[PDB]
């Protein structure tokens, strides 16, 4: 998109969360019309996302810990995001 | 279309 910029936050889980909600996916109702992308769309107060304080509403995810989220479902999101890990390098295209 | 949002 015209004008956007691309942004990393580290954000580290406490008590298995980081925080925040996604919408869309593919195979999903859109969350911003014409883009079947992944996108933050809640962030929850003194969670871990808030803290760290750089991911926004509306953000698009592009890669979580270099795992692309072009082109995947809201199901394959999801278990990515309840893996294992706890830290996560995302990568967001903020319009 | 199914239209989740899914706290992580």
Known sequence: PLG????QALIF???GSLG??????????SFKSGDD???????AKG???DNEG???????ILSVN????????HEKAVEILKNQDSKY?????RS | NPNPETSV
């Open chain 1, 4 to 7: 956007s910029e691309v942004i």
């Open chain 1, 13 to 15: 889980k406490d008590d």
């Open chain 1, 20 to 29: 925040l909600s996604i919408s869309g996916g593919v195979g999903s109702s």
């Open chain 1, 37 to 43: 992308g992944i996108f933050v769309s809640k962030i």
């Open chain 1, 47 to 49: 969670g871990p996302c």
């Open chain 1, 54 to 60: 750089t991911l926004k509403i509306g953000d698009k």
């Open chain 1, 66 to 73: 270099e795992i692309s989220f072009t082109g995947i479902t």
């Open chain 1, 89 to 93: 390098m995302v990568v967001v295209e």
